[PDB]
């Protein structure tokens, strides 16, 4: 019964893991490595998927995120999380799923609508996902949820909310604006998500305190918003310093100049590269920071599917515990590892 230290927004998906033959991602146009959402051809492809025996698991980005999160705190309701689902049985299937891990939920029914699914297809060693939002798209923020999240000081959205309304996001940042302690994370998501929004997102950024996102999605930050010099948005980001001038570039979109005592951050992971970030600190002054991934053969990585929700998980984890940045990092880098070491998105019963 708390207290709830991470409150987060997102889209509630289940994900339908199941291995799959070749003839099955042909049969609907699917590439396999790729993650998409589901196009008008491939909407039997659930229905369909049944006769492989899927085995049914909580997903989505968000969620996630917050479940690594409640699992390190383990006390219920340690952490929050809002969204919308279907008034059908998936969605009472994904609830229970949530209820059983102590996580504080409130998803919000669409009537006739769909919970957002997910097709984690396995095949020759490969991951292929198709998406299908759903009812995900009607989710409309609560008046009360501040109410809901009572006692949080860490709030967290990913760039995939937008695609129901950048509203969402814009409120719960709005809330933790002006407000010196309250954190408001945002993740960049995907690509797409920095094209398809990018004025919302410049608006929101400027709302945002700790930023996550990966290298290709920097990449289209740092050229949607001109951050580096044309000649440079080509650069590899596997460059430490091209990943540093990308990181400085975008913590500007974050701090507009200013300098207040409220956190302003930025954090590419990269692989198996060291994870970078930029730091406004208290006196304005910005600091690099390079946190080294521990090495783990490529023997054992099953699949890097999840590895940067549980990175976020991670550093979500141990920022309320009060670690500091390079802490928050490594224990977001211990997370990631963990999860890329075995089947599914969750950290494993041992860890
Ligand atoms: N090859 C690797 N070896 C060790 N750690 C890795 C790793 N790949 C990823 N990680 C861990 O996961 C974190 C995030 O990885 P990454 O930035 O590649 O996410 P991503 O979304 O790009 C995965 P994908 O390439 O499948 O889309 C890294 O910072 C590290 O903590
Ligand atoms: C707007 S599209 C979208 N939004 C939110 N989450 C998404 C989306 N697409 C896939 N996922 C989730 O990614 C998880 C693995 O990182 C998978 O578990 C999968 O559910
Ligand atoms: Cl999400
Ligand atoms: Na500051
Ligand atoms: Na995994």
């Not at 996902?129 to 967290?156: K, Q």
Request: hydrophobic content about 40%; some cysteine.
């Amino acid at each position: 019964t708390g207290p709830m230290r991470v409150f987060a927004i997102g889209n509630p998906i289940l994900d339908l893991v199941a291995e799959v033959p070749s003839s099955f991602l042909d049969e609907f146009f699917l590439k396999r490595g790729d993650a998409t959402l589901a196009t008008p051809e491939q909407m039997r492809i659930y229905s369909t998927l049944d006769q492989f025996n899927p085995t049914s698991l909580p997903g989505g980005s968000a969620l996630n995120s917050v479940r690594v999160v409640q699992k390190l705190l383990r006390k219920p309701g340690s952490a929050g999380y809002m969204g919308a689902i279907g008034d059908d049985p998936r969605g009472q299937v994904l609830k229970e799923l949530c209820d059983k891990e102590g996580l504080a939920t409130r998803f919000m029914v669409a009537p006739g609508q769909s919970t957002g699914v997910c097709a984690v297809l396995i095949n020759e060693k490969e991951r292929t996902l198709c998406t299908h939002l759903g009812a995900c798209g009607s989710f409309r923020l609560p008046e009360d949820w501040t109410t809901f999240a009572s006692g949080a000081l860490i709030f967290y959205a990913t760039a995939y909310t937008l695609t129901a309304t950048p509203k969402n996001a814009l409120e719960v940042a709005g809330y933790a604006h002006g407000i010196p302690n309250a954190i408001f994370t945002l993740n960049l998501s995907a690509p797409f998500c920095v094209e398809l929004y990018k004025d919302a997102m410049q608006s929101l950024l400027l709302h945002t305190n700790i930023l996550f996102g990966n290298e290709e999605e920097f990449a289209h930050l740092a050229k949607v918003h001109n951050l580096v010099a044309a000649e440079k948005t080509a650069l590899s980001t596997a460059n430490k310093e091209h990943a540093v001038e990308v990181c400085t570039g975008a913590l500007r979109l974050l701090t507009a100049g200013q300098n207040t005592s409220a956190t302003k951050l930025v954090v590419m992971t990269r692989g198996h590269n060291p994870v970078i970030a930029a730091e406004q600190t208290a006196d304005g002054t910005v600091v690099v920071h390079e946190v080294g991934v521990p090495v783990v053969a490529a023997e054992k990585i099953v699949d890097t599917n999840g590895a940067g929700d549980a990175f976020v998980g991670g550093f979500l984890y141990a920022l309320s515990q009060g670690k500091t940045v390079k802490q928050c990092i490594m224990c977001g880098n211990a997370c990631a590892q963990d999860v890329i070491q075995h089947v599914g998105f969750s950290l494993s019963f041992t860890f």
